[PDB]
Structure formats: structure tokens, C-alpha cells
Amino acid sequence: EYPTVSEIPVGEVRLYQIADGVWSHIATQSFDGAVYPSNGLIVRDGDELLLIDTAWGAKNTAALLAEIEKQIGLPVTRAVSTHFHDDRVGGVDVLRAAGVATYASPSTRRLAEVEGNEIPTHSLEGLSSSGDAVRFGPVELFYPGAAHSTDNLVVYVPSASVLYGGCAIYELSRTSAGNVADADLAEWPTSIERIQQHYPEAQFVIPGHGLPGGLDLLKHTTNVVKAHTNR
Numbered sequence: 001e002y003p004t005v006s007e008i009p010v011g012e013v014r015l016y017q018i019a020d021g022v023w024s025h026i027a028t029q030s031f032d033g034a035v036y037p038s039n040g041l042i043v044r045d046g047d048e049l050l051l052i053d054t055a056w057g058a059k060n061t062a063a064l065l066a067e068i069e070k071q072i073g074l075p076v077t078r079a080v081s082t083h084f085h086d087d088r089v090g091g092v093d094v095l096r097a098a099g100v101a102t103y104a105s106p107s108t109r110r111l112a113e114v115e116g117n118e119i120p121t122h123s124l125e126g127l128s129s130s131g132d133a134v135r136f137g138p139v140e141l142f143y144p145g146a147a148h149s150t151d152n153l154v155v156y157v158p159s160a161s162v163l164y165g166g167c168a169i170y171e172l173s174r175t176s177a178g179n180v181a182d183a184d185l186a187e188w189p190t191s192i193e194r195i196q197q198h199y200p201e202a203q204f205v206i207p208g209h210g211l212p213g214g215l216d217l218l219k220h221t222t223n224v225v226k227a228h229t230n231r
């Protein structure tokens with residue numbers, strides 16, 4: 001049922017409804033000779049929508065907005081990017097031109113500037129220490145510590161028990177580590193443990209790339225990271 005990388009042409013975006021007022025968005029991109037899928041989230045906020053992450057580039061993000069209008073028909077008023085890589089912030093300028101207020105932590109904004117990626121306009125305060133959580137409308141934002149990147153955030157939707165792990169959480173089909181150039185391998189398992197301790201009630205866990213599962217995705221990611229550490 002959930003769309004896989006093999007079913008989505010690059011340039012098109014699919015929506016997958018998880019619960020009342022909660023969807024993921026799925027897009028694909030060519031990178032380094034291969035095609036990869038990528039996930040983000042959409043959460044209803046009264047008569048408006050909160051977006052988590054772009055759809056990996058300007059063209060995909062324009063298609064994302066069009067697919068939201070077609071399938072949901074409510075305006076995206078705010079967006080949060082969960083780390084500084086281009087699959088999370090590429091398309092921010094499209095969002096801004098459409099009137100969306102774009103947000104990220106100060107860490108993420110700094111790292112995006114250094115890398116030359118697009119920079120969300122607004123700053124999320126209260127997330128600079130491991131274990132910090134803040135409310136953002138219908139979600140909670142959580143900084144678990146450094147993992148896939150030093151700035152990575154996770155997002156929890158309490159009304160639906162949906163945990164969006166972003167790129168700090170791997171899908172089951174990925175059995176070897178991905179791009180870890182910006183990672184903190186030594187801390188990544190401890191950061192995952194903070195996620196488990198804070199959201200032990202989660203029922204639906206979404207990785208940054210690939211198929212959702214349950215909290216077993218956390219143990220899976222720990223296994224893969226530790227195997228890479230022991231290479």
C-alpha cells in the first residue's frame with residue numbers, strides 16, 4: 001500500500017494518509033547514479049496544514065504543493081525542516097514564495113548556510129540540548145542528540161501516535177549505513193535510546209527514506225549503525 005521507490009517517477013509526489021489529519025509525502029530523486037525515495041509529513045492544524053520537510057528540490061516541492069491542493073485543499077501555513085541536507089531544505093524558497101513561514105533550529109540554519117543550501121527564515125528556540133522538546137502546534141519537536149547529523153530533529157504527533165524519525169531512523173530494507181559523512185557515529189545509538197525513552201507509546205514510525213514500521217525501526221537502526229562502527 002505504501003508507495004515504494006519503484007512506483008514514483010522523479011518529479012511526481014504521492015501522499016499517504018496515516019490517520020485523521022496526518023499524511024506522509026513521498027518523492028524520489030536521482031543522486032550519485034541511483035534513484036532514492038524520500039519522506040516528509042503533513043499534519044492538519046485546524047483549517048491549515050503544518051508541513052515537515054521539503055520534497056527534495058524545487059521541482060518536487062512545487063509538485064508537493066499542487067498535490068496537497070488537489071487531495072486535501074487546505075493551505076500550508078508553516079513548515080519545519082528537520083536537518084540541513086538538501087532533501088529537507090531544498091525547496092524552501094518555493095515554500096516561502098507561496099507564503100509559507102519556514103522554520104528550523106539555529107543549528108540547522110547555520111549548517112545550511114555553510115553548505116550552501118536554502119535557509120528557513122524562522123528560528124526554533126529551546127532545542128539546543130539533547131533531550132529538549134518543544135510544542136509546535138499539533139506536533140512535538142524533539143532534539144535527541146547528534147546522530148545522522150548534529151542538528152537532526154524528530155517529530156511526534158500525539159493525536160495519532162506517529163513518530164517521524166527523519167534521516168536518523170533507517171527503513172528495514174536498508175541493511176548497511178548510508179551517507180554518514182556528517183554523522184556522530186559514537187553518539188547515534190545513545191540518541192536513538194533517548195527517542196525510545198521519550199516516545200515509548202509510538203505506534204507508526206516513519207524513516208527519512210523508505211517504508212514506515214513500528215518502534216522496531218529504532219532497534220534496526222542501532223544494529224546497522226553499530227555494524228558500520230565495527231567495520
Ligand SMILES: CCOC(=O)[C@]1(CS)N[C@@H](C(=O)O)C(C)(C)S1
Pocket residue numbers: 031036085086087167178179180209
Ligand atoms: C541532497 C543530498 O542528500 C543526501 O546526500 C542524503 C541526505 S540524508 N543522504 C543520502 C544517503 O544517505 O545515501 C540519500 C540519498 C539517502 S539523501
Ligand SMILES: [Zn+2]
Pocket residue numbers: 083085148149167
Ligand atoms: Zn541527511
Ligand SMILES: [Zn+2]
Pocket residue numbers: 101121122
Ligand atoms: Zn514569517
Ligand SMILES: [Zn+2]
Pocket residue numbers: 085087167208209
Ligand atoms: Zn535524508
